Design a protein around this ligand. Structure first.
Ligand SMILES: *Cc1c(COP(=O)(O)O)cnc(C)c1O
Ligand SMILES: *Cc1c(COP(=O)(O)O)cnc(C)c1O
Lengths: 422, 422
């Protein structure tokens, strides 16, 4: 018994067989893939469907008169609809992009050009944001003149409900609030609805890159204005992301990028724009990445996405339990049920890169060491550290095809690393 | 005998076998794919390599933290080298993007943000430009205040050497010149060396999206400042493009997009940027797309790119001469050896969309009708037309896997339309 409360040994066994990378061995040990927070492994049946699409159903899309162009166009718009149903949005509220990062850049630039984010307006973000939801705001404040303010994290990197309510006293009327739906370092799932009510007049953006892959997201319930995520973190193709926005807001936004398809009329001197969603898709999109993403979502819904979520939840609880028992590790983030997907940590007396190196070479375990694209968060964690804090951490992250046994290999690995450095 | 002065019947038939779409039949007719100028068919061996990458050598990149991460990093970066070598560029001068369109948008925003293209300045483009190399200039000139000027086309859409000189009399020192390498409507390969020598102090950008797939481009010899093209038009994956820029210029440009990997140091208040080329690659790129495009380049080089080029030339000249024989069609563009790849035309008394539909439903022939994302050029061609010009054209376009027989099926379909429908 694989030790699941969610999947039978047969269903689960079938799932694992969908991921050929799991048959890889590193120095004679099976691959134990715990770097899911950076990117995920690919499903053979999904990738075969993309291959069939490239080889037999492919051409450029829209203005479709010939047979392949119709097929490709229909498949692409069908993919948009699968994504809209997955988020409870309408299809004209789904814009295909290159990724989360592009999505955030699209918003900052489009909000400023549309006249919504002005000089001396304030954008409020959190201290635990990924560079993708931090650097565009901080750098572009120098060109457009807005100010950036932060919701502060505690010395373990936690954004408490109290911090959220306290920030509102101090920054009462932010023009934009952009926050992570879940930290790629602390593992903390954020209280999005509490944020939405506390900053009732703000344009609210959620960085969904870590959240969307393992937890149900209903954009109407959350009442977010915009949400972004990346395909490659949900078993999907690279080069494909999603931007969701409220139809009423998208209708007033200046396009980020310009070119073909997004126009209606072009003259040498002026342009007008197409309707939604095409207004915000300039030139040839990642047609096959979109179709592939659609097929990824079909795969997840065939397993059943509530089961995906529960399985990841039980893996997360087990990972965090086992990590908390080790007396020679320091763990970051909340020790509560908001903590999901991943555990960032340091082994006392051992450099993070050595932890990841030995885990990989001697135990076949893939983890990541470093700042995890959250350099300012590291400075916050340093203040609460009780060790000689290396300004970086090790990170183990779980997803669909992981097991409790994978986690037991990680633990065995870490014990070994402690005994080896003494 | 397949009528090639370039490939033996043996080699040619192996090349055809690489493209499974060619086995498709439309109402009993074999696919005759002549919409290459929109996008190209995919090679099975290439797509199998991409499949092997996705399933067995996949992870996020640029940090040597575990075995699959290193593999994936090496593969992506060797793909960057393959592109650099194909264009005779250094690898730090090659930036992966989502396509040609994102590439132009990058340049316009970055040139403005960097203080290079200012309110006083003029960008010179041509009247034949695709929307990708027209709309961003026109629309952003309204936010940034620079001026847009145009090299004029004659009434068949031809950009003559004399028109280029005449523009130089009125606009002797444009800050930026952005010009097509080859028009997607007239097929005219532009005289890039002439343009480079005539505007020697401008920042010269070439939109190579139609050109690069079938003609050797040596960026050092041409001495262009920037060049852009799209993967999907050179047998490659969707969602992937290339931007080439001279190292000395890339080093002074503000990045277009911000996020992970493109930074060096991030604080809550300031950022610094990574080295070339990563300065201009924000967040996770289309990893597998880049690898695929490398393998596409390998494939073209195993055939022999000079042979590809000569095959497309021989096909282009046959297409144009057979179209010139037909007294019921109006042909656009120059009737000389500058005309390559594609022929835009109208059938007298028949709407372009009906031509395309009849060709597809009766002859298996894929063509495109519409404005081809060049609406201002349509207005230019309207004045030279001798028929009731429908503000659109039919276009047939040839590439590697096409044959003189394919072109003969097109011609037969056009005569069927004339003879019977009528
Ligand atoms: C991965 C991630 C991003 C950036 O995604 P890309 O796909 O690399 O553009 C942003 N935010 C969070 C929280 C992430 O985990
Ligand atoms: C196709 C094309 C473009 C746009 O390419 P995308 O891949 O759609 O970004 C730009 N210029 C010309 C001349 C083209 O043929």
């Amino acid at each position: 018994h694989m030790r699941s409360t969610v999947f039978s040994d047969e269903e689960f066994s079938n799932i694992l067989n969908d991921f050929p990378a799991l048959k890889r061995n590193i120095n004679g040990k099976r691959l134990v893939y715990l770097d899911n927070a950076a990117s995920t492994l690919k499903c053979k049946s999904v990738i075969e469907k993309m291959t069939d699409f490239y080889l037999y159903h492919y051409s450029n899309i829209h203005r479709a008169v010939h047979t392949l162009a119709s097929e490709a166009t229909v498949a692409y718009e069908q993919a948009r609809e699968k994504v809209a149903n997955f988020l409870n949005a309408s299809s004209e509220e789904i814009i295909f992009t290159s990724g989360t990062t592009m999505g955030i850049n699209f918003l900052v630039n489009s909000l400023a050009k549309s006249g919504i984010l002005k000089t001396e307006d304030t954008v409020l973000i959190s201290q635990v944001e990924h560079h993708a939801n931090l650097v565009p705001w901080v750098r572009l404040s120098k060109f457009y003149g807005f100010k950036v303010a932060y919701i502060t994290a505690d010395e373990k990197g936690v954004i408490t409900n109290e911090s959220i309510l306290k920030t509102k006293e101090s920054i009462p009327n932010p023009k934009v609030v952009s926050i992570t739906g879940q930290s790629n370092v602390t593992g903390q799932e954020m209280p999005i609805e509490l944020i939405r009510e506390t900053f009732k007049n703000a344009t609210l953006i959620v960085d969904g890159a870590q959240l969307v892959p393992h937890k149900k997201v209903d954009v109407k319930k959350l009442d977010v204005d915009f949400l972004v995520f990346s395909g490659h973190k949900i078993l999907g193709p690279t080069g494909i992301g999603v931007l969701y926005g409220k139809k009423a807001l998208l209708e007033q936004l200046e396009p980020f990028l310009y070119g073909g398809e997004m126009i209606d009329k072009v003259t040498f001197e002026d342009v007008t724009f197409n309707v939604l969603p095409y207004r915000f898709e300039a030139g040839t999109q990642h047609i096959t990445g979109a179709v592939g993403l659609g097929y990824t979502i079909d795969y997840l819904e065939s397993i059943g996405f509530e089961k995906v979520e529960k399985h990841v939840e039980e893996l997360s609880n087990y990972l965090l339990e086992k990590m908390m028992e080790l007396d020679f590790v320091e763990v970051y983030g909340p020790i509560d049920s908001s903590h999901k997907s991943l555990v960032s940590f340091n082994v006392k007396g051992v450099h993070p890169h050595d932890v990841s190196h030995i885990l990989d070479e001697n135990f076949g375990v893939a983890t990541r060491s470093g700042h995890h694209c959250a350099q300012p968060l590291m400075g916050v964690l340093a203040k609460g550290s009780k060790i000689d804090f290396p300004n970086s951490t090790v990170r183990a992250s779980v997803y669909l095809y992981n097991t409790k046994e994978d986690i037991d290999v990680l633990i065995e690995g870490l014990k070994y690393i402690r005994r080896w450095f003494e």
